[PDB]
């Protein structure tokens, strides 16, 4: 998310046993990065 000029990145790694969709269950994401960019963002894409 991109709020108040800060780019915040939260994440969580979990083990799973499921090949179709998102596992059902619950886990919280701890913050990883807070970037003070002040950059307007409106679009994004993924890189594989």
């Amino acid at each position: 998310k991109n709020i108040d000029g800060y780019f915040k990145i939260y994440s969580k790694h979990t083990p799973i046993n499921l090949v179709r969709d998102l596992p059902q269950g619950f886990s919280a994401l701890e913050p990883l990065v807070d970037l003070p960019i002040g950059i307007n963002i409106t679009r994004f894409q993924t890189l594989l």
């Binding site: 108040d4 000029g5 800060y6 003070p36 960019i37 002040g38």
Partner: protein, 49 residues
Amino acid sequence: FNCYFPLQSYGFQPTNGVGYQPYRVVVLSFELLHAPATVCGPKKSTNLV
């Protein structure tokens, strides 16, 4: 005639007058935009009691 190069060299010799001696100059300008402020001072701490 009436067509000159805009620049000219400085004469910096060790024996030159202080008025004509070379001086290194740095001008620091401070900017507050619609962005996070990312250049801050040291903000010194103290001991804990």
